[PDB]
Amino acid sequence: HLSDMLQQLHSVNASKPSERGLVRQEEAEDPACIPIFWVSKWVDYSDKYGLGYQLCDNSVGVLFNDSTRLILYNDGDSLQYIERDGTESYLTVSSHPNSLMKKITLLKYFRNYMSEHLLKAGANITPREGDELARLPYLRTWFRTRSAIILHLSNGSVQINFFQDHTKLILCPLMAAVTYIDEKRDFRTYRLSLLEEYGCCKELASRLRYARTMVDKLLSSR
């Protein structure tokens, strides 16, 4: 879907949504497209350990330097491990697996740190309804630019948090939608096809051009 995201972001930009006679992005709204998952907290420690993240359901994930991942579930006991090829495994905290015991204790540092010291993003927003027992999405790859950090998940999502103005950009290619969060922390969910029809402001257009550039980077860092 990373390639499908290019085709959606090409059409909206080729229509030039800020250069219109009258901008009406309120008419492009669609609240029923709100994502199920997004990254609420992150911790860079890739110089030693890896990047750790927290999803909106309080689940904590961590991506190690050798491209291996270990996720802890919402009950605080269930552990899912993904290997350096995309192979998944299931085990528990109390019933201690000795081979991963180092990574469990490292995960715990990330988990404690985020619950104690960090601020939750998109907090007030009510998430979308999903299958209760379905699998969690993990982190495929990430990179940092000057202006933003780019988070690419395993469910097709791409999230882009901007550093200076605290704004965030969630891209969902499956039902073709974008969820915006401004600096004053107000959330709006848009349909991209309707964002062509009716257009948007300058800051939404300049960040939808910038997102497209990050997608091209995500295809090139492989």
Partner: peptide, 8 residues
């Protein structure tokens, strides 16, 4: 102690 993290 991390060098970098999300909004604190």
């Amino acid at each position: 102690d991390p060098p970098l993290h999300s909004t604190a």
